[PDB]
Design an enzyme around this catalytic site. Structure first.
Site, PDB file in Angstrom:
ATOM      1  N   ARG A  45     -39.859 -29.670  10.328  1.00 36.38           N
ATOM      2  CA  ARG A  45     -40.365 -30.787   9.520  1.00 36.38           C
ATOM      3  C   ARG A  45     -39.265 -31.778   9.145  1.00 36.38           C
ATOM      4  O   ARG A  45     -39.511 -33.007   9.076  1.00 36.38           O
ATOM      5  CB  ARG A  45     -41.094 -30.279   8.262  1.00 36.38           C
ATOM      6  CG  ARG A  45     -42.067 -31.314   7.754  1.00 36.38           C
ATOM      7  CD  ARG A  45     -42.560 -31.110   6.348  1.00 36.38           C
ATOM      8  NE  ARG A  45     -43.715 -31.953   6.088  1.00 36.38           N
ATOM      9  CZ  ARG A  45     -44.049 -32.410   4.857  1.00 36.38           C
ATOM     10  NH1 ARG A  45     -43.319 -32.142   3.805  1.00 36.38           N
ATOM     11  NH2 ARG A  45     -45.157 -33.155   4.814  1.00 36.38           N
ATOM     12  N   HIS A  49     -39.551 -35.730   9.758  1.00 38.23           N
ATOM     13  CA  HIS A  49     -39.541 -36.703   8.695  1.00 38.23           C
ATOM     14  C   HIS A  49     -38.337 -37.638   8.760  1.00 38.23           C
ATOM     15  O   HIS A  49     -38.429 -38.800   8.347  1.00 38.23           O
ATOM     16  CB  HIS A  49     -39.595 -35.972   7.359  1.00 38.23           C
ATOM     17  CG  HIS A  49     -41.004 -35.761   6.911  1.00 38.23           C
ATOM     18  ND1 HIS A  49     -41.397 -35.614   5.612  1.00 38.23           N
ATOM     19  CD2 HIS A  49     -42.154 -35.678   7.619  1.00 38.23           C
ATOM     20  CE1 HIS A  49     -42.703 -35.441   5.504  1.00 38.23           C
ATOM     21  NE2 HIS A  49     -43.194 -35.494   6.727  1.00 38.23           N
ATOM     22  N   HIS A 172     -48.163 -27.889  13.208  1.00 38.87           N
ATOM     23  CA  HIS A 172     -48.744 -27.309  12.016  1.00 38.87           C
ATOM     24  C   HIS A 172     -49.175 -25.863  12.239  1.00 38.87           C
ATOM     25  O   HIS A 172     -49.642 -25.211  11.315  1.00 38.87           O
ATOM     26  CB  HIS A 172     -49.917 -28.157  11.495  1.00 38.87           C
ATOM     27  CG  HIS A 172     -49.438 -29.333  10.690  1.00 38.87           C
ATOM     28  ND1 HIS A 172     -50.320 -30.285  10.182  1.00 38.87           N
ATOM     29  CD2 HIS A 172     -48.191 -29.680  10.266  1.00 38.87           C
ATOM     30  CE1 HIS A 172     -49.589 -31.168   9.494  1.00 38.87           C
ATOM     31  NE2 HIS A 172     -48.301 -30.841   9.530  1.00 38.87           N
ATOM     32  N   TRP A 188     -51.572 -22.446   8.097  1.00 38.50           N
ATOM     33  CA  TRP A 188     -52.583 -22.863   9.051  1.00 38.50           C
ATOM     34  C   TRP A 188     -52.982 -21.713   9.963  1.00 38.50           C
ATOM     35  O   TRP A 188     -54.020 -21.826  10.678  1.00 38.50           O
ATOM     36  CB  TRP A 188     -52.054 -24.006   9.864  1.00 38.50           C
ATOM     37  CG  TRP A 188     -51.832 -25.308   9.211  1.00 38.50           C
ATOM     38  CD1 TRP A 188     -52.728 -26.323   9.115  1.00 38.50           C
ATOM     39  CD2 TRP A 188     -50.641 -25.779   8.581  1.00 38.50           C
ATOM     40  NE1 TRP A 188     -52.185 -27.384   8.455  1.00 38.50           N
ATOM     41  CE2 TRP A 188     -50.894 -27.082   8.115  1.00 38.50           C
ATOM     42  CE3 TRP A 188     -49.385 -25.211   8.370  1.00 38.50           C
ATOM     43  CZ2 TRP A 188     -49.947 -27.847   7.434  1.00 38.50           C
ATOM     44  CZ3 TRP A 188     -48.432 -25.987   7.700  1.00 38.50           C
ATOM     45  CH2 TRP A 188     -48.697 -27.283   7.243  1.00 38.50           C
TER      46      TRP A 188
HETATM   47  C1  HEM Z   1     -50.937 -37.160   9.999  1.00 40.50           C
HETATM   48  C2  HEM Z   1     -49.679 -36.514  10.119  1.00 40.50           C
HETATM   49  C3  HEM Z   1     -49.190 -35.449   9.284  1.00 40.50           C
HETATM   50  C4  HEM Z   1     -49.466 -35.177   7.990  1.00 40.50           C
HETATM   51  C5  HEM Z   1     -50.324 -35.946   6.992  1.00 40.50           C
HETATM   52  C6  HEM Z   1     -48.744 -33.999   7.622  1.00 40.50           C
HETATM   53  C7  HEM Z   1     -48.744 -33.412   6.370  1.00 40.50           C
HETATM   54  C8  HEM Z   1     -48.127 -32.190   6.036  1.00 40.50           C
HETATM   55  C9  HEM Z   1     -48.161 -31.608   4.718  1.00 40.50           C
HETATM   56  C10 HEM Z   1     -48.929 -32.118   3.501  1.00 40.50           C
HETATM   57  C11 HEM Z   1     -47.354 -30.496   4.806  1.00 40.50           C
HETATM   58  C12 HEM Z   1     -47.107 -29.459   3.738  1.00 40.50           C
HETATM   59  C13 HEM Z   1     -45.791 -29.757   3.018  1.00 40.50           C
HETATM   60  C14 HEM Z   1     -45.585 -28.652   1.991  1.00 40.50           C
HETATM   61  O1  HEM Z   1     -46.416 -28.512   1.041  1.00 40.50           O
HETATM   62  O2  HEM Z   1     -44.596 -27.915   2.147  1.00 40.50           O
HETATM   63  C15 HEM Z   1     -46.838 -30.394   6.130  1.00 40.50           C
HETATM   64  C16 HEM Z   1     -46.035 -29.366   6.572  1.00 40.50           C
HETATM   65  C17 HEM Z   1     -45.460 -29.348   7.850  1.00 40.50           C
HETATM   66  N1  HEM Z   1     -45.588 -30.334   8.805  1.00 40.50           N
HETATM   67 FE1  HEM Z   1     -46.741 -31.950   8.741  1.00 40.50          FE
HETATM   68  N2  HEM Z   1     -47.982 -33.554   8.693  1.00 40.50           N
HETATM   69  C18 HEM Z   1     -48.224 -34.430   9.727  1.00 40.50           C
HETATM   70  C19 HEM Z   1     -47.598 -34.430  10.958  1.00 40.50           C
HETATM   71  C20 HEM Z   1     -46.615 -33.512  11.361  1.00 40.50           C
HETATM   72  C21 HEM Z   1     -45.857 -33.616  12.592  1.00 40.50           C
HETATM   73  C22 HEM Z   1     -46.039 -34.803  13.518  1.00 40.50           C
HETATM   74  C23 HEM Z   1     -44.995 -32.563  12.607  1.00 40.50           C
HETATM   75  C24 HEM Z   1     -43.925 -32.254  13.524  1.00 40.50           C
HETATM   76  C25 HEM Z   1     -44.065 -32.394  14.899  1.00 40.50           C
HETATM   77  C26 HEM Z   1     -45.214 -31.807  11.406  1.00 40.50           C
HETATM   78  C27 HEM Z   1     -44.597 -30.614  11.067  1.00 40.50           C
HETATM   79  C28 HEM Z   1     -44.804 -29.894   9.873  1.00 40.50           C
HETATM   80  C29 HEM Z   1     -44.261 -28.572   9.593  1.00 40.50           C
HETATM   81  C30 HEM Z   1     -43.434 -27.809  10.604  1.00 40.50           C
HETATM   82  C31 HEM Z   1     -44.687 -28.228   8.354  1.00 40.50           C
HETATM   83  C32 HEM Z   1     -44.437 -26.954   7.583  1.00 40.50           C
HETATM   84  C33 HEM Z   1     -43.225 -27.116   6.671  1.00 40.50           C
HETATM   85  C34 HEM Z   1     -42.865 -25.859   5.903  1.00 40.50           C
HETATM   86  O3  HEM Z   1     -43.440 -24.761   6.071  1.00 40.50           O
HETATM   87  O4  HEM Z   1     -41.917 -25.954   5.044  1.00 40.50           O
HETATM   88  N3  HEM Z   1     -46.206 -32.421  10.614  1.00 40.50           N
HETATM   89  N4  HEM Z   1     -47.303 -31.469   6.879  1.00 40.50           N
END
Ligand code: HEM
EC number: 1.11.1.5
Length: 291
Positions: A45, A49, A172, A188
């Site tokens: 992430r 970001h 995700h 997820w």
């Molecule tokens: C419409 C696009 C996206 C939205 C709105 C979104 C939103 C989110 C949200 C709300 C979280 C949870 C953050 C938390 O509470 O820790 C999250 C986690 C994460 N997202 Fe996204 N995301 C998007 C696209 C992506 C993309 C493009 C990637 C990477 C290729 C990605 C990788 C991750 C990963 C790996 C996590 C888990 C982080 C953790 O466990 O600490 N996301 N995302």
């Protein structure tokens, strides 16, 4: 503003494989983080970001300048929790002070995907740190409470098409939402520190219920204890996205290949690579090296 990749002086593939390896070894060692999920997901992430602030219209933001190190960007509410990935990388940067910040944040993501048994992600060096006033303002990363039209329009700014968006969202599978971070809670799926196509399978095959979480936000929940954000769920509400979700749910290798391309692209948006730059590097995993 043109950002030309500039190879860290005198460095070559072996130097970056050493950085890869140090990241990978710490990933293995520091296994307790996040109730034993480990740092893989948050490093993926972080890479996204730090890259996803890019605007194709004027080449602001993006991975090149490593601007997350400045307080405006590290304190973006959208980046809540990523400080854990930054702190992880700090001893890596201390050991290898020659690597640029953008190169390290992006390499962290590559290394995490690969060490979690994901596809190989070719990676190019040459990001150069840029000054504090080049840090993009908050608000360029996406909202989770929106629909497919939002998602599609959002990602046009990153020059991503429908296939690229659906592929990227497969990340995700990893990690989880944390209520105090994003206002969403839950993983997820089951395999959340192994890179697989599970995100697509769960979207199609779980029985989802639209519920409110304890932060009063709506999310989709299953009896297995999994969740999807509204933006995740939008991928099966929109018929164009749905087709692609079904493709990746039914072909792991295709998902791997398309993810790899899209993720490299995300990490390289905004960067101009000279004609005589090195070819992209493909790092060996620790396992492949016998380490
Ligand atoms: C419409 C696009 C996206 C939205 C709105 C979104 C939103 C989110 C949200 C709300 C979280 C949870 C953050 C938390 O509470 O820790 C999250 C986690 C994460 N997202 Fe996204 N995301 C998007 C696209 C992506 C993309 C493009 C990637 C990477 C290729 C990605 C990788 C991750 C990963 C790996 C996590 C888990 C982080 C953790 O466990 O600490 N996301 N995302």
């Amino acid at each position: 503003l043109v950002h030309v990749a500039s190879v860290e002086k005198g460095r070559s593939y072996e130097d970056f494989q050493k950085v890869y390896n140090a990241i990978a070894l710490k990933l293995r060692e520091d296994d307790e983080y996040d109730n034993y999920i480990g740092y893989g997901p948050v490093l993926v992430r972080l890479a996204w970001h730090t890259s996803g602030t890019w605007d194709k219209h004027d080449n602001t933001g993006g991975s090149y300048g490593g601007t997350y190190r400045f307080k405006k960007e590290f304190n973006d509410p959208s980046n809540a929790g990523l400080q854990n990935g930054f702190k992880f990388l700090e001893p890596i940067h201390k050991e290898f002070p020659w690597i640029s910040s953008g190169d390290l944040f992006s390499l962290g993501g590559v290394t995490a995907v690969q060490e979690m048994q994901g596809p190989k992600i070719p990676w190019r060096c040459g990001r150069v740190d840029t000054p504090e006033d080049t840090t993009p303002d908050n608000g360029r990363l996406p909202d989770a409470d929106k629909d497919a039209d939002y998602v599609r329009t959002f990602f046009q700014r990153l020059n991503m098409n429908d296939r690229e968006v659906v592929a990227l969202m497969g990340a995700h599978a990893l990690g989880k939402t944390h209520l105090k971070r994003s206002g969403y809670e839950g993983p997820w799926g089951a395999a959340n520190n192994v890179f697989t196509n599970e995100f697509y399978l769960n979207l199609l095959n779980e029985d989802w219920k639209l519920e409110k979480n304890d932060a009063n936000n709506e999310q989709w929940d299953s009896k297995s204890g999994y969740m999807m954000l509204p933006t995740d769920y939008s991928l099966i509400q929109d018929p164009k996205y749905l087709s692609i979700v079904k493709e990746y749910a039914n072909d792991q290798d295709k998902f791997f290949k398309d993810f790899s391309k899209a993720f490299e692209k995300l990490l390289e948006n905004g960067i101009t690579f000279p004609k005589d730059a090195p070819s992209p590097f493909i790092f060996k995993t620790l396992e492949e090296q016998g380490l």
